[PDB]
């Protein structure tokens, strides 16, 4: 690696900086707010009574969490369909408001609840606009509605049978003027009687047995969403380099116990430059502290290609209880500037050859090995100072020394258009 | 400038080999600072020790000499100076100096003991012992006042010296704001690094300053343009920071050279 | 009647804990040394324009100042907000209610036309509030702890914390207080720059304006 | 770089905070020049005639 | 589109050249300071006695 970075086939004695290392992340943890109050959906899809098709019940559901997985993965409903979005993703979708329309119809009419459909139900009873529909669910009512004896209790707004000519076999018209009277409309002397009935006889046949149909529509972009689905929950891990979203805000680091105290309305603390430092988890309502995962450049101490072919590896500024040859086997020495492997530590002290940092350096100079020692500031002596003693030299020497100084460098001219 | 993202590295690898230039410049200036400290302080080839018993003709050096009571063996003025002035997130690391503080203190103590006991003879060879009064006589001869003056006024000069050193100790202890230059250097370094790390969260004309979201919300055809804008902005900021650091390093080099000249001339001799 | 607001109306802008840090914020606040329209409504309930949030203060220790009506038409044409107190339950209705000459309430309803949302929740005491409506979110602050720095005037320094927050998403530009059938200040907020000094525990202890004086 | 405009001013503050250190460097240079002149010439305490 | 491509190439090469020029200027200043020191040493220690 040193030869690669330097781009040469030979290297001299010294310390070189080749690359850097970074502790890789681990398993992830995902969190959200603790619990949301469940709306009473069983009063809608599993009520004891329903409404007629010409007076289908409409209700509003909002400001809670909706779990569509339980009603979607349970095969207790005859017909299940959804438009625009796959049902399995409704547990991860957010909407403004939800509208539920419930009624009871015959078995054959269940196919007529869709945008762009036609019929007695579509034109007079349940007018679905030509737009995306949330989800249509239907189930057989022969077990509770018809079998108990309710074979005539449902009425349907067909038409007035008043102002149509024989255009085809079925005399069906859209001119429904009357019907405001709660007595199915009075045509003076009961000339016309709209709102015919259903023959929900259980033994007549499954073709027109009672069927409960509920249609769910969702309000989009009219206001910020208030209803969402059940979100996936997992546990937490400590003292590991972990990536997370942790109830909304992403982050990679190591968790630890914290000492900070929050006011009852904060969410997370920081120090500077939008760097989160402490966070609180809604499920546990506890504060934890975040520390960035360790990293740093590596370095190689080498005595030169000529002398030997062995090197020592120094990791900078990392407590190397877990760094992972020169990964775990070789001898380790923890300094104030990281830790080094491949070189032994002796207690002696000599002159300094290859500087490292924190007052120590490594070489082989005072057997075919690299030793790291604490440098010595020099020799040691004490001069016997006394108030009536002097020392006078008696001989002299003349010495010649050399000093070197640069005074110039090359003159280079570069064109602008040419380059 | 990538924040652990693969496509960011894929885009970045086509801009050239500028990172080698940046790392080379920073390593060069760091090595130069190490050489600066080494050339300023490493001026003696021994470590002298003052005799246990002290009688310097009446002078009193107790406030200047190192104290064995302190574990760091630092004198009173050193403690006052250290207590007076007071000062690794996303790839911004700080390396420790080669010479720890204790070694610097030992160098200063050796220099001071050598200049007390021997005079200026240890700046040209082997240290030669000499009584203190007969050294002050030489230093008075050096400025034109005959040596006859000193020997007849020794007690008065000793009292003057002690009173002056007491007054300067009191002035340093009480009056602050006399150490402006070092505080300014530290503040400049910290402020430059802090504004560099503050620059990270600017929009730079892109859609957002968070890269993971901008990738997760878009597709390559325009995510390429957005990421390119962010990369070029961040690279320009980093280059500006490096240039400013180079200028400051040159200034500090000039100051350190002047300090080395003063230390070599006014301590190991007489100006 | 007019009054001078010494240093009132500083609130926690967001939900970010901090410690021993000087932070500069650029939001809507009540400027230092501003004019507050002191009212003495004892034996009037004028309708006042909203204009992007209002500061409110009161010192009555009884059940008289209970409700607030918000809107821009005050008719069945567009929905309006009613926020009334009941001493046991805070009911908030954003449905449509028709005009009212002068409401009488306290322990007015016209109809529930196009009703689409409803919500339910839970020296005297210096009631202080700040009402904001921004990007479809309606925020109400509060401070119910009184500080007697001076008497008969609201002097002292305190911080305000959020209590509720609603995604109503409605356009309101006008409001009106409530009484029953038989001394609350007012203030308007401006887009100012402030400098806040957080404590060690994370509480605001000092604020400085940036558009008041050269020293500032 | 804007010249009494609003759109340019809005676009400028989005690029970061370069101008702070630009102005800081220029002011530091000016202060240094004043210090240079004063230190070069102010070398006496009294005024002699 | 050739104009766009040449724009990109030109801006890149301009940035590289600017960086090179700045580095050259810094190095020249430092070398000039060293040359002044050498001139002082030569004038003082060779033509006289220190
Ligand atoms: C906020 O104030 C604005 C006034 O600028 C109100 O916006 C207007 O609301 C009406 C409601 O009838 C909109 O008319 C409708 O527009 C839709 C298209 O989305 C159209 O299909 C309908 O037939 C009807 O014409 C009008 O477009 C809209 N104008 C603007 C500029 O948004 C708004 O009502 C106020 N907010 C609330 C919550 O009331
Ligand atoms: C919030 O989540 C927790 C953990 O799933 C639920 O368990 C309670 O946790 C709190 C600590 O936050 C403990 O003091 C309680 O004793 C726990 N309860 C039980 C039964 O073990 C807690 O129920 C959740 N809160 C709500 C309102 O659902
Ligand atoms: C590197 O981390 C280890 C922890 O794995 C540190 O070990 C410490 O050892 C002492 C001795 O028993 C304990 O009292 C400490 O509690 C340990 N630290 C922790 C955080 O648990 C080790 O000291 C660290 N290395 C350096 C140089 O600090
Ligand atoms: C002058 O006298 C001094 C003091 O007696 C000498 O210093 C001692 O020299 C011996 C010679 O080996 C050493 O063993 C002692 O350790 C020295 N004393 C101290 C305190 O270091 C000194 O050597 C004499 N001068 C000469 C030229 O010999
Ligand atoms: C001072 O030292 C020099 C050497 O450094 C001495 O000269 C040496 O003297 C011996 C004995 O006469 C000769 O064998 C050597 O060849 C001489 N050296 C040289 C380089 O010529 C000189 O004697 C010493 N001074 C005194 C007074 O003894
Ligand atoms: C040198 O000066 C120091 C100043 O601290 C003297 O130390 C004080 O000496 C006086 C009287 O000798 C004592 O009352 C003080 O208690 C000493 N200071 C402390 C901190 O204990 C020292 O005595 C002087 N030395 C000489 C030889 O005069
Ligand atoms: C911060 O909050 C604490 C407790 O919520 C306040 O009380 C201090 O609590 C610590 C921890 O027990 C004690 O050591 C202190 O003595 C307490 N202080 C007082 C005045 O009693 C504390 O006052 C709050 N403020 C600060 C600045 O800490
Ligand atoms: C009443 C008070 O405290 N401050 C001022 C008052 O001085 C001034 O006269 C008035 C309008 O003129 O606005 C308010
Ligand atoms: C009778 C009536 O008021 N109908 C309105 C309708 O026009 C409007 O579209 C809808 C919300 O958009 O609220 C309801
Ligand atoms: C009510 O829920 C139960 C639970 O699965 C289901 O078996 C039953 O069929 C539901 N009732 C109706 C009428 O669908
Ligand atoms: C190694 O050093 C020896 C002694 O200096 C020298 O003769 C030899 O040429 C060197 N070889 C290399 C490859 O540097
Ligand atoms: C330092 O000296 C002690 C004393 O014997 C010894 O045990 C220790 O091994 C020495 N240090 C090293 C690195 O060998
Ligand atoms: C209002 O308060 C009264 C008495 O305090 C109580 O009976 C009534 O239920 C409350 N209103 C609501 C909506 O809870």
Author numbering:
A (entry chain A): 298 to 621, 635 to 676, 689 to 741
B (entry chain B): 742 to 828, 854 to 1037
C (entry chain B): 27 to 69, 80 to 143, 159 to 173, 186 to 245, 264 to 297
D (entry chain C): 742 to 790
E (entry chain A): 988 to 1037
Paper quotes:
The SARS-CoV-2 S protein (hereafter S protein) is responsible for host recognition and viral entry. The S protein binds to the receptor, angiotensin converting enzyme 2 (ACE2), through an upward open RBD conformation (RBD-up); a downward closed RBD conformation (RBD-down) sequesters its receptor-binding motif (RBM) from receptor binding, rendering such a conformation inactive. The D614G mutation in the spike protein of SARS-CoV-2 alters the fitness of the virus, leading to the dominant form observed in the COVID-19 pandemic. Here we demonstrated by cryo-electron microscopy that the D614G mutation resulted in increased propensity of multiple receptor-binding domains (RBDs) in an upward conformation poised for host receptor binding.
In this work, we determined the cryo-EM structure of S-D614G and revealed the high degree of conformational heterogeneity mostly confined within the RBDs. Multiple substates within the one RBD-up or two RBD-up conformational space were determined. Collectively, 62% of the total population of S-D614G had one RBD in an up conformation (one RBD-up), including three distinct substates that separated the RBD conformations, and 38% of the population had two RBDs in an up conformation (two RBD-up) with two different substates. The three distinct RBD-up substrates in the one RBD-up class showed a 39 to 52° upward rotation with respect to the hinge defined as the Cα atom of the beginning of RBD, i.e., residue 330. Contrary to S-D614, we did not observe any all RBD-down conformation in S-D614G, in line with the previous study of a similar construct without the transmembrane domain, but differs from the full-length S-D614G that exhibits significant amount of closed, all RBD-down conformation. Compared with the wild-type S (hereafter S-D614), the increased propensity of S-D614G in the RBD-up conformation implicated the facilitation of the binding to the receptor ACE2. However, our cryo-EM structure of S-D614G showed no appreciable structural difference in the proximity of the mutation site with respect to some of the extremities of the reported S-D614 structures, including the first reported structures of S-D614 (4, 5), the acid-stabilized form of S-D614 (22), the disulfide- and proline-stabilized HexPro-S variant, and the furin-cleaved S-D614 that adopts a more open conformation. Meanwhile, Benton et al. proposed that the loss of a key salt bridge formed by D614 of one protomer and K584 or the other protomer due to the D614G mutation leads to local disorder, thereby increasing the dynamics of S-D614G and more populated RBD-up conformations, a finding that could be confirmed by our cryo-EM structures. We argue that the increased stability of S-D614G could be further attributed to the increased configurational entropy manifested in the higher conformational heterogeneity of the RBDs, which contributes to the free energy gain of the system.
